Design a protein around this ligand. Structure first.
Ligand SMILES: [Cu+2]
Ligand SMILES: [Cu+2]
Ligand SMILES: [Cu+2]
Ligand SMILES: [Cu+2]
Ligand SMILES: [O]
Ligand SMILES: [O]
Lengths: 528, 529
């Protein structure tokens, strides 16, 4: 049974004399990036499966505003119960291509919650410019990917924000990569000119990733993860009561509207990391509403084209394995039938070959992945990673439940165990990912006022190219926040607010309308 | 001074003892409403029309390939969503307003489907009777059926479909059939209805079928004796629904029953059963075959609205809503679990006109096409309290008290199973018309011999569809829950379960063979909780 390890581990081993592990990893990645785009083991093909390049439903795209519905032209499952197992298979399938080059090689995980990441950000092997392979200096293949062919719909006369030219290089925070219209490219050029130094950019990113994990501005001593950060949310997720609500944000959201307390699906901190690496400043609501760093990882469209997507998803799979171990679901999973999250119409809408209204279950095929026999993989094929897929997860953060982790999530004596529901944000238009941050102020009769931060919600979403003015996806926003930061007697005095950080329509001609709508929103606040 | 909606059976008792001015007012009002011209939004044609047909279409959705198409509803009524109880509340209210425009002050009464009369004798004859004595001349009874004053027609050149019904079409109930819009359908309807030429006999068959439904078995003489499986038991169970969301509709109740121990019955469920009883399904149909050929107006949502008994039945559904409102403390407040199945326009029948696929339904959303004095759309907010907001109440009637009897009818007998059966493995079914599922269990002991248990019924009240590919019908995943309270707890793990279907056979002889084969080829999947 092969072991997948912490990549920080492979890097320490490299710096201490033992280099074949990191060198094997790099060699295999060089190998798959060099395969041609038409080869289904090429990194371009593999990154392609997630999102773009898309398959369209032209009859749906022409529907009027009252009849149109959202769908997904990529194969990835998001906001549904196939989120964990589809990505499980996806990483496994890219490991298979790596093995094409270097037999027996294992895909490590970026351990997002280890001590190194809390204190120093992303392991440098994922950001370094260069690497020593066969005593030669090569370009580090994990830093980014150059597109061998264009992402293009090849429609004569047309260019949209989905499209990226041949030679396009993937980018992370703080850079922008939306280049398919003249407007987006121009704004991208202006935005990137504000971040011209690669070394400074790497620092900015490491600092944002630490701030996301912490849940507040990074401290220079020991890490001190608060209850609101991505550390806390990954911990909370290992307590999800059942697979259905562990698995996705649609299921967990309705569970949290219908049951006491709060569950966190693994998809939730996973969304957090996307936005962190992919262009959102945790502190962004102290500055403005618009996150202009349109990086590949920040939306599902081209996230799969960035190598770090697989190191991150390797850690997401890890967390799913750990949840399986700690809750005894190593061999069997269950789905609440017809629960929100089990429908192809949920969230991103249906993937290719699915229809509106169609159920999703453990037998549903995880396209486009196929076995040696040519038969479609299903969730049944990949529940026990040791038994059916032939690999395990080495040791890393969070794999044991402990007193320290229990006291992190726990309500300070005399603080509210209640929860806040934010709604009244009905039928908002979706262009790109966005974040919500909730706060509370309380004012005494004597006039003193305290301020409370209640936490964040990351909606990982997509770019959308539509055929009419008002034909974007509509979404009801619903968000639940703990009140644990507040003392219980302040809750009835409280005045709540939310701040959004969003894409502003993707381009400058869409920005003022986006800002006006968000500023106009009058959310409803409900205390349990 | 809240007006009093009464039992129509009570109004007939009083007519027979010489107090005739209440039932004469009702009938007078229904005559006046049926004689208004069709363009008048108070004409029974327009009121009946609001529920379903005449349809508003979404021509670009009708044109979609089979992978992209989705169901939608061209009528205004809400079914399988949280607006079912409140939309229909306002529909009955608005019909009542129309009646009042003909006879000031009149109250729309309710067919008490669960009183001792209905259990023993079926429908009160005031609703089935051919004739009625008003102002000296004996008139046609407007409550027994309705004549269309204009066609239900899409007026398309060269086309005719099962939605369409000619001017002069008369609504029908079990045992008659009423699909007439293609030649095959009209032929079958003529042949079928000619087997049933006597009105008196037809009424007896209807009353017998209604009584069978209510009971859960063949109607027995004397003490009606409802079982745990009948529509009586189901209405009783719906008053224990833990919240409004799952009380309100079949979609919410279904997901609840998949995700909580025990069994909830929404009010829409017994309501569905009455529709099918009156609109063409024989409770004991599964002893005869799979097809229910009596295509009555009440049996599908398409034209049910045009049969006057719709409003007597729904007046009782509203009463049951009120009774649940009374017994659970929601006379003044309702709430909806946010994003729960049943809170989306995409659910069940699909979006009504105006609405968009993923759009949410709450106590705020307009109950089209109903409108107050101020031209502003009604909402559920406007009709939570019937006493304070609408100025009417429900007089006494069956089931309005919790009662030892009711308890030990739904009670699990001693040693019998408290477990639940879940029926599954029936995915992507094509829907043409309403259908019924009936669940059974056999148990062979070691001594070779076999017992049979009836576990109950599930009515899917649905719709006739007209589509533009063979493969393009609405697809439904069928999930059903049945109690095992009928069988002894130690018989359960030995049990071999089965379901039978009674369905419309595609509506026409030419679709019947295909439909029978598809059903016979289902391999349902069974699970015990
Ligand atoms: Cu993904
Ligand atoms: Cu991801
Ligand atoms: Cu209805
Ligand atoms: Cu009805
Ligand atoms: O993702
Ligand atoms: O209905």
């Amino acid at each position: 049974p092969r072991v997948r390890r912490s990549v920080r581990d492979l890097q320490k081993r490299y710096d201490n004399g033992e280099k074949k592990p990191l060198e094997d990893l790099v060699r295999a990645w060089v190998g798959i990036q060099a395969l041609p785009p038409s080869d289904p083991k090429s990194f371009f093909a593999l990154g392609g499966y997630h999102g773009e390049p898309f398959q369209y439903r032209k009859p749906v795209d022409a529907l009027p505003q009252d009849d149109i519905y959202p769908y997904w032209g990529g194969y990835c499952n998001h906001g549904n119960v196939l989120f964990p197992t589809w990505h499980r298979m996806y990483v496994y399938k890219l490991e298979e291509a790596l093995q094409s080059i270097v037999p027996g090689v294992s895909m490590p995980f970026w351990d997002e919650t280890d001590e190194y990441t809390l204190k120093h950000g992303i392991p440098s092997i994922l950001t370094q410019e260069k690497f020593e392979l066969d005593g030669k200096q090569i370009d580090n293949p994990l830093r980014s990917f150059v597109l061998p062919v264009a992402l293009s719909d090849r429609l004569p006369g047309d260019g949209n924000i989905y499209e990226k030219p041949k030679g396009y290089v993937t980018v992370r925070y703080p850079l922008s990569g939306l280049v398919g219209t003249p407007e987006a490219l121009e704004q991208t050029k202006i935005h990137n000119a504000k971040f011209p130094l690669p070394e400074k950019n790497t620092e900015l990113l490491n600092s944002n990733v630490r701030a996301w994990l912490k849940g507040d501005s990074p401290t220079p001593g020991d890490p001190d993860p608060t209850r609101n950060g991505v550390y806390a949310k990954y911990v909370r997720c290992l307590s999800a009561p059942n697979y259905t609500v562990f698995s996705n944000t649609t299921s967990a959201s309705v569970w949290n509207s219908s049951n006491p307390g709060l569950v966190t699906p693994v998809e939730s901190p996973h969304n957090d990391i996307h936005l962190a690496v992919g262009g959102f400043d945790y502190g962004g609501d102290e500055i403005g509403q618009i996150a202009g760093a349109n990086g590949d990882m920040g939306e599902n469209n081209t996230a799969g084209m960035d190598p770090i997507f697989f190191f991150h998803h390797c850690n997401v799979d890890r967390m799913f394995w750990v949840w399986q171990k700690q809750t005894g679901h190593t061999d069997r999973l269950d789905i609440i039938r017809n629960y929100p999250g089990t429908n192809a119409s949920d969230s991103q809408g249906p993937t290719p070959g699915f229809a509106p209204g169609e159920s999703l279950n453990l037998t549903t095929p995880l396209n486009p992945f196929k076995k040696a026999s040519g038969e479609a993989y299903t969730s049944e094929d990949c529940i026990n990673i040791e038994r059916q897929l032939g690999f395990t997860y080495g040791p890393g953060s969070l794999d044991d439940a402990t007193p320290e982790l229990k006291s992190l999530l726990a309500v300070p004596s005399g603080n509210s165990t209640k929860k806040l529901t934010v709604t009244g944000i009905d039928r908002a238009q979706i262009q790109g990912s966005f974040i919500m941050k909730a706060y509370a102020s309380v004012t005494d009769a004597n006039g003193k006022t305290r301020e409370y931060y209640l936490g964040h919600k990351s909606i990982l979403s997509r770019w959308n190219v539509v055929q009419c003015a008002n034909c974007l996806t509509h979404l009801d926003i619903v968000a639940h926040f703990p009140l644990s930061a507040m003392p219980a007697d302040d809750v009835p005095k409280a005045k709540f607010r939310v701040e959004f950080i969003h894409r502003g329509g993707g381009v400058p001609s869409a920005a003022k309308a986006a800002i006006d709508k968000v500023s106009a929103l009058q959310p409803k606040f409900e205390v349990s």
